[PDB]
Amino acid sequence: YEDGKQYTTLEKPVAGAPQVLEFFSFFCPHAYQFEEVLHISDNVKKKLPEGVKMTKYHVNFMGGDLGKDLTQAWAVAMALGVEDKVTVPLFEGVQKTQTIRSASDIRDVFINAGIKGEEYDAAWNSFVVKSLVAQQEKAAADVQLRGVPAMFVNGKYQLNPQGMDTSNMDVFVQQYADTVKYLSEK
Numbered sequence: 185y186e187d188g189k190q191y192t193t194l195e196k197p198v199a200g201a202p203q204v205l206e207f208f209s210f211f212c213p214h215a216y217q218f219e220e221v222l223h224i225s226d227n228v229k230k231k232l233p234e235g236v237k238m239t240k241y242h243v244n245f246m247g248g249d250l251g252k253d254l255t256q257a258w259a260v261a262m263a264l265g266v267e268d269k270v271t272v273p274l275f276e277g278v279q280k281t282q283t284i285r286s287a288s289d290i291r292d293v294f295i296n297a298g299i300k301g302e303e304y305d306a307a308w309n310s311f312v313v314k315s316l317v318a319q320q321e322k323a324a325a326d327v328q329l330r331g332v333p334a335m336f337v338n339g340k341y342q343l344n345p346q347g348m349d350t351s352n353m354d355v356f357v358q359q360y361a362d363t364v365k366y367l368s369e370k
């Protein structure tokens with residue numbers, strides 16, 4: 185494992201932080217890059233068993249006001265538990281068909297995903313969401329988020345991809361996957 189290589193350790197723990205935290209933006213990386221980060225993100229879970237939950241927050245430091253809307257829209261997603269239904273259409277919407285330009289178009293993605301309009305409007309104006317939006321930004325600050333994608337464990341560690349199983353990707357994934365495990369059981 186040797187810290188400094190695959191996982192760094194923060195000069196200062198974050199207390200009260202999720203067992204596993206991922207940070208992402210609907211604005212970067214682009215295309216296949218976003219879709220493979222997604223795969224990796226997914227496998228870390230088919231291997232992080234027994235009570236260890238994964239959390240994923242959006243970061244607004246990319247996108248401006250459409251970015252602050254997306255961070256709010258992601259809070260609605262987590263509230264409604266529709267993360268796996270709106271991720272790709274949101275991703276493809278903002279980036280691929282470049283159709284999402286306003287907070288309204290975001291709404292169109294949820295509705296076109298099966299979520300009722302009033303359910304969505306009720307969450308977007310709901311409190312739970314306002315508290316998730318603040319909860320997301322805090323986390324970004326607490327770890328002094330620099331950029332994405334990023335993953336932290338127990339609030340102690342910052343996973344570290346680029347000093348690890350280079351070539352391939354499957355080989356990459358099992359290590360990024362194996363690393364997160366330890367830190368949990370650590």
Ligand SMILES: CCCCCCCCCCCC
Binds near residue numbers: 206221222224226356
């Ligand atoms: C779960 C997403 C983890 C993100 C780290 C993936 C980005 C590093 C992979 C790109 C370098 C091979």
